[PDB]
Amino acid sequence: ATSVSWKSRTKYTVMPVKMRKSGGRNHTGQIQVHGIGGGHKQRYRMIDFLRFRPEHESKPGPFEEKVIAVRYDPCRSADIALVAGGNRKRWIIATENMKAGDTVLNSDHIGRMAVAAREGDAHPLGALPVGTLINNVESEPGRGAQYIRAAGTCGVLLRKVNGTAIIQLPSKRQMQVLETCIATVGRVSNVDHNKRVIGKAGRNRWLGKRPNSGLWQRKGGWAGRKIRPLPPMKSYVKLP
Amino acid sequence: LGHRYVNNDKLSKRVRKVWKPQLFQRELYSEILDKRFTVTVTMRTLDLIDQACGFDFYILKTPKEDLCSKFGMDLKRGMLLRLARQDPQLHPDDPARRAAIYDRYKAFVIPEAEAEWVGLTLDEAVEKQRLLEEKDPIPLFKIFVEELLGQLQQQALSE
RNA sequence: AGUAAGGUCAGCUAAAUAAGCUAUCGGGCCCAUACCCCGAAAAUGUUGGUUAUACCCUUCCCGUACUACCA
RNA sequence: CUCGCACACGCUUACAUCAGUAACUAAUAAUAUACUGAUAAUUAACAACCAAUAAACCAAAACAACACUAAAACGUUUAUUAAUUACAUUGUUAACCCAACACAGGAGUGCACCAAGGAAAGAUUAAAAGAAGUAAAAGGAACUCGGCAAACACAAACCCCGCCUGUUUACCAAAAACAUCACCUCUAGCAUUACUAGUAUUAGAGGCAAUGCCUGCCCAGUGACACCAGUUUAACGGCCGCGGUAUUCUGACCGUGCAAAGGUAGCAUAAUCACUUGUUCUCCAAAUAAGGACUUGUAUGAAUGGCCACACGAGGGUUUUACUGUCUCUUACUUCCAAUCAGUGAAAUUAACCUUCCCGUGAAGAGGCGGGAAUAAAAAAAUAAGACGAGAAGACCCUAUGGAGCUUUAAUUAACUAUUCCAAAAGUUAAACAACUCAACCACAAAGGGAUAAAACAUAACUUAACAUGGACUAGCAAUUUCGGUUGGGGUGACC
RNA sequence: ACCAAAGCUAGCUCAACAUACUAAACAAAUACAAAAAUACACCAAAAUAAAAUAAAACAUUCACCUAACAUUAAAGUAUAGGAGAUAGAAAUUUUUAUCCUGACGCUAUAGAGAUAGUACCGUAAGGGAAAGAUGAAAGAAUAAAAUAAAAGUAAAAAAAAGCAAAGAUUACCCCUUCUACCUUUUGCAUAAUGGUUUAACCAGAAAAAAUCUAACAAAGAGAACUUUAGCUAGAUACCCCGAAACCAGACGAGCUACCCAUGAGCAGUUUAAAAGAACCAACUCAUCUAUGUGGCAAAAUAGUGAGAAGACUUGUAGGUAGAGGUGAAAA
């Protein structure tokens, strides 16, 4: 029997929304991804990925917002921060040292010389300095942030040529993107998420991971330390 | 749908094999209806269109057994009714163009009673026949009044 | 028990065109020895059959090797 | 003597009043919650049924003051609408349900452990054997595979394998197996149903098992990647002979050969082929046990992990102390069985039996044949030598041109997923380059003699997102079918 | 003398003719969890049948096996086949209407499963029975007639000795002589197999060549063919029960494995602790031994044990279905 996905909400709201676990079962009802299920109940926060979003289209100019509080989000491995400006509030991903009572500037005006890089400001890649650490990379203009959102992951801008910016992803793979895409300066919060130690098998079950199967599989040819050259740069710029 | 032999050798394995036609997306223009239809057509259909020297000719010349499509039969029925009715709605502003279009297909003209049943299936025809024959029952008051009037006139003419 | 399988200079290897290295013997170089240079000698485990022999087969002998399981 | 009242779920009149039971139901009788006939009954306040849209709202339940990590069920108010009209419909019994039974089994929540609910013995006798309970002289493991069981005991220490809590073969194995924190390898740059409303500190496909000290050498082969050379073993896997040499022994060393490298550290007669009860010491009066050493283990060995340790264990082995009928060696007394009497009354089994012993014979172990012995007929209670006892058309073994599961280097080879090429389809562009003057004209710039062609291709060349057809290539997954015979039983060797 | 015995109807089978083919009943309620009068919708779908088998194996192949429009012949011919098993046409021919339809078919272990798809066994798809006897009148039950004949018992327990009987005998035994019966084997009283006994039911089937009898005969046969004594017709023939399996389509996650929803439990004691800590109940698993072994129980009872604030137990309800689901791999 076909099931219904819980992602039915249409209007954005800062308050936590109800969430139903899947357990690896697809809409049909069969297991597709193993080792998922039986976790602690969680609520989902509506995260606004697009940093640049004016309240009204009457004034498309840059706007500045204020940070209210930094909370812990069970879904993602990072920490989200509540940000309010004008007549609306938004949940956005907090950088390394974002705290309460702080002001964050969002802008898109690509200036010729430069703009000073602050720890929370979001600016287009065309105005940022060459040596800037960035996160929440927008792959295409207006598409929204998709890359570099995990805890402690930060990409570094490399160069800007013929009106096009090239960045380095955390996987040490170069990515080419138009300079007008919005990006956030800094490193994602909760830096020591990698150094966290799980004390017992039960803590894995609390997170929601079921134990692996006990079948003993002999290793094939895929195993072994593989040394492979770095793949070529991935470019999203459509050359006419 | 059928089977085949691997390597085309009789003494080889017998294998189920399905051959599918290659389908293409094209939009076609019909002069009778002056409308463009985006129809999934095959390369054989386009060759038959060129062979008949016209899209309207292809529909109006190929019989039902050659077409094998309910859309084609409805398309023929729509154009066949257009010719028989001689609708002035084809081009309200160009009466000269109207005469030219129907002049070329003058050999396919069929009477009205024949042009509205060419594209109907068995189920569609029965519904159409019932709709034409759908008559409310005549009240017995009307039947009895006519019976009484006949007797009264019969008695009147008997004196 | 059965099966497998090998013997070659003093020693170890490669070829059956019985060679190469080392050891052994003689000489040179040095104060002497060794290194080094020069020269010489040296063998196909055993019996029989393989045109005739050898690499082959057979007999004798030494030694090597695997397996010996279900109740 | 103590699982009692009520709700939910389930069952469906089996409940109540009166009457009858010769017989049917209760495994018996009385008798009637349980069998038969007639009549009657559960009354809603509790429970079911019991509005929609838009907007504001980041702030946990644990006496919640305030905090922790695993980040948490539990809504109010404002606005716009909502038939407005006593009495609607439905569940209300029970000793009950699921297990073939009126079955010692299975069964959720609230409140009590009682004020409520129930009867272990039908009547006798007091044999054996069997089950359950209590007590014991002297001895205290002398029993035995084992201290299993039992006990006035309820302690101490060593070793092996796993770190630990946890998990598994419902119905013969609860373990040393699996999982697990840790470490490591591998594959992926990303959007509307899984992974994920996530984005490499992320998520999958696996290995090995915390910690601590370590994880040596080897890309020849195979596999994978690169898809070319090549690169990879914390990928599958591998990690050596012969001869001589210090008085003797041993062999630092040397000669020679083959390899991709020749087993390094550690530990060790181990859960580790055989030799094996290796040898020695400690423990015991006595040691095929246990611990500690010696150690080529020519078949130990390093993430198919080696080694050491704390804690832990209904795992396996050993020792001391304390206890005891385990035992030397059994005994006494109770209850359920038992035997007699009264009621109801089953099962496997059964060719016909009037159903003895011995020796011999015999399809090779005779109640039945042969030669001899014994021999009034029946009943009740006991012990298990035989009836090749009863039970299951032997699980072992072989045969069957009888099946099936698993694996692959067996034979044949699709679909599907993924990779690559060609064709189809769609689109783009098109008319083309290596002199040099030797003479010599020309104010230049160039020129003339001594070459300045033809041709591009009869179309050509290239691109093509998403879908998608035909024909091939590679890989994954997977499909079909079989696995000869003779054999002093089969396999093995051999043979045809 | 009990238990029993006997009966002939209920209806059924195979055809023929034949209208032309989802009956009977539909007042109300019937696809909400069917039989519940009454609210803003979604609605719907197709992809060659495969294999058991035959070829004494099995891979190409294997009649009928969904859809033929028949009969007499051409003919089991041409052809198609690991050219093996077996498969097999057509051209061309033949066919006079209606009535004469009933039974060398069964009679309650037969005939349909049927008194009935009802009881009953299964969650479900599905499986699926046994069962009737008086007479003209029982408004002739102090009622009547009929066999008193299966195994099993009673009337009537037994008296040395033997495959239970035979030879006999004045006399039942006593005497003498005899190793049950089928199946299977070189050979069985064998301690090799099967049977308690009774009634009912249960297993040889085909006509090419041939032999026997007859008609007519160089010709026979009521067309189509065979013929150097042949042709036509008759008669004479070849079993039953049983696998593990294989393929296709349905129905099953109310037990169990795992997961998604929504709920509900963990008292006391020890510690700054709600720490996959510790002692011990409820609760959940099932270590060891003894009873039990057609048992209370198709896995339990008694004693003793491990966990008992978690990777924990548990109620309701939903999801994944056999080439699969699920799995802290025990196939």
Ligand SMILES: [K+]
């Ligand atoms: K987080």
Ligand SMILES: [K+]
């Ligand atoms: K009931």
Ligand SMILES: [K+]
């Ligand atoms: K012992």
Ligand SMILES: [K+]
């Ligand atoms: K356990």
Ligand SMILES: [K+]
């Ligand atoms: K390699």
Ligand SMILES: [K+]
């Ligand atoms: K030892």
Ligand SMILES: [K+]
């Ligand atoms: K244990």
Ligand SMILES: [K+]
């Ligand atoms: K006995």
Ligand SMILES: [K+]
């Ligand atoms: K023998």
Ligand SMILES: [K+]
């Ligand atoms: K037997």
Ligand SMILES: [K+]
């Ligand atoms: K037999």
Ligand SMILES: [K+]
């Ligand atoms: K028999």
Ligand SMILES: [K+]
């Ligand atoms: K279900």
Ligand SMILES: [K+]
């Ligand atoms: K029971």
Ligand SMILES: [Mg+2]
């Ligand atoms: Mg998550």
Ligand SMILES: [Mg+2]
């Ligand atoms: Mg893992």
